[PDB]
Amino acid sequence: LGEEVQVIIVGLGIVGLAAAIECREKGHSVHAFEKSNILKSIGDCIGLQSNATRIIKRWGDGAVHEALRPWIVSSKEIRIHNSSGRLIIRQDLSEVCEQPNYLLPRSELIRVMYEHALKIGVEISLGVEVCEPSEDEEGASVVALTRDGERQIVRGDFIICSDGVHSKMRKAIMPQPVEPRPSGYAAFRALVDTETLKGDPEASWVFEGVEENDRFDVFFLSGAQIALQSCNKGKVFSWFCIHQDTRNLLDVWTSPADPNEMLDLIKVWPIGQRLWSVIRHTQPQKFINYPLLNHKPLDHWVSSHGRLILIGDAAHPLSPAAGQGASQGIEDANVLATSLSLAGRQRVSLALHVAERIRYARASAVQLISHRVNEGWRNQDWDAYEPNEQNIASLPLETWIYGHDSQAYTEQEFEMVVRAVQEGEEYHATNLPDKLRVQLGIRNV
Numbered sequence: 001l002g003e004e005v006q007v008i009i010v011g012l013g014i015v016g017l018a019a020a021i022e023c024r025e026k027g028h029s030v031h032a033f034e035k036s037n038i039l040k041s042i043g044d045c046i047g048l049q050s051n052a053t054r055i056i057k058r059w060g061d062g063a064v065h066e067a068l069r070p071w072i073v074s075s076k077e078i079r080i081h082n083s084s085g086r087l088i089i090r091q092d093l094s095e096v097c098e099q100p101n102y103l104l105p106r107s108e109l110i111r112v113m114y115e116h117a118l119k120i121g122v123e124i125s126l127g128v129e130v131c132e133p134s135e136d137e138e139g140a141s142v143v144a145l146t147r148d149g150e151r152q153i154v155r156g157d158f159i160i161c162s163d164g165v166h167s168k169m170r171k172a173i174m175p176q177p178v179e180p181r182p183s184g185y186a187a188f189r190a191l192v193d194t195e196t197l198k199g200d201p202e203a204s205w206v207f208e209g210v211e212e213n214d215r216f217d218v219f220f221l222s223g224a225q226i227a228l229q230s231c232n233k234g235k236v237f238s239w240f241c242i243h244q245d246t247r248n249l250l251d252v253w254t255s256p257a258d259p260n261e262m263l264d265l266i267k268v269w270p271i272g273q274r275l276w277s278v279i280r281h282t283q284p285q286k287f288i289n290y291p292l293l294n295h296k297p298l299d300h301w302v303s304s305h306g307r308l309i310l311i312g313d314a315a316h317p318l319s320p321a322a323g324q325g326a327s328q329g330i331e332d333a334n335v336l337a338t339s340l341s342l343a344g345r346q347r348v349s350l351a352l353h354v355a356e357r358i359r360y361a362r363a364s365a366v367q368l369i370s371h372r373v374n375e376g377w378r379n380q381d382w383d384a385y386e387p388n389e390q391n392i393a394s395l396p397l398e399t400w401i402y403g404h405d406s407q408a409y410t411e412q413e414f415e416m417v418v419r420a421v422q423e424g425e426e427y428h429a430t431n432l433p434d435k436l437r438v439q440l441g442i443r444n445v
């Protein structure tokens with residue numbers, strides 16, 4: 001017959017934009033829907049590791065990577081300090097940053113990806129909340145709701161559910177929700193106002209060397225782990241502070257936290273004032289206190305008829321750390337688009353199920369390693385013990401993660417995964433260490 005493949009994408013965060021670009025560059029017709037005004041600045045910085053940048057580098061013949069070049073990480077080490085600000089450990093980043101990594105405001109990453117998606121012909125509809133997905137053996141559909149209450153049925157060959165950690169699409173796949181477990185920790189975090197930071201002489205130290213090497217400082221205080229970073233030659237500074245918090249906080253990016261809670265936490269220790277000299281230039285409405293919740297892996301990501309798939313934080317939400325949360329979502333988009341092109345238009349359900357088998361254990365392993373990091377904090381004493389790079393929130397920094405080429409793996413393994421899906425056998429993926437799958441309690445889909 002020959003009609004274009006019709007892809008529906010629900011949610012244009014990082015992962016939905018990546019999926020839109022990957023699918024459109026395979027020639028599909030892509031209609032993406034997003035309920036919020038995503039061009040408005042919100043949040044702070046996102047990191048992307050080499051497993052994500054090697055995917056991004058292929059897009060638009062390298063054009064997106066060229067746009068992101070100012071944001072390539074130039075830190076060569078993490079400088080880890082105690083509560084007096086004395087340097088204890090320099091953790092070398094030369095292998096992690098052998099290939100490009102990015103650090104940049106999330107809103108700027110969104111803007112660059114959005115502009116590329118428009119340029120290549122992704123159809124985008126903002127101010128639309130998608131609900132009520134359905135599917136049968138031949139296609140899928142959703143209801144698109146504008147804010148003024150107009151309803152429209154939208155039909156497609158399959159739905160990519162990239163609607164984030166609070167995904168309402170997720171109830172179409174998993175009938176019952178599993179509530180995440182609070183880690184007992186939260187992260188104060190924000191961007192600093194660079195203009196007021198400049199011209200505060202008591203904060204001038206933070207600019208030292210940032211035009212040659214991005215700042216990447218960590219400080220361990222009793223009950224407080226503070227990271228301070230710069231990017232794009234000192235144009236942007238960001239920070240976070242991991243701390244105990246048992247309040248019933250919502251995991252959203254929209255509510256202003258009390259800056260004095262952060263000040264009280266750090267000002268009683270020797271380095272606190274020096275840290276505050278920079279962090280006090282955070283705009284008073286931009287202080288975020290984000291709870292770190294641990295989500296268990298889902299039983300599966302693909303719907304009964306194989307025409308809806310959860311990817312990104314809808315499927316495997318992690319704490320904002322490493323860059324690996326976002327980076328795993330970008331691998332979702334790449335593997336899914338590659339699977340769709342190897343399977344062909346007549347085998348959509350196969351393509352989605354193959355993508356799931358390739359992604360599931362690897363994504364779940366990154367998720368469970370993330371849990372181990374914040375579960376370790378309850379047994380630690382950051383005042384009594386010397387600072388330990390093993391305790392930093394930026395972990396894991398593992399070659400089997402950031403060195404991986406998800407597209408090449410998918411090409412090589414596609415026919416083997418097809419046989420597993422069609423025969424109903426387990427697929428033992430080798431895109432994570434052999435013993436890691438069994439070691440973490442991971443149950444194959």
Ligand SMILES: Cc1cc2nc3c(=O)[nH]c(=O)nc-3n(C[C@H](O)[C@H](O)[C@H](O)COP(=O)(O)OP(=O)(O)OC[C@H]3O[C@@H](n4cnc5c(N)ncnc54)[C@H](O)[C@@H]3O)c2cc1C
Pocket residue numbers: 010011012013014015016033034035036038042043044045046047106128129130131162163164165167168253311312313314320321325326327329
């Ligand atoms: C406003 C915001 C700010 C963030 N800031 C940071 C930050 O500074 N640092 C960081 O590390 N991570 C941040 N994150 C999280 C980060 O984007 C994710 O953890 C991950 O990197 C990518 O997840 P995602 O693309 O799957 O989902 P998300 O980034 O959460 O995107 C989901 C998108 O789907 C949209 N959506 C949800 N439901 C519907 C629906 N029914 N119909 C239509 N659209 C829908 C949402 O409006 C949102 O744009 C932020 C997320 C948000 C939403």
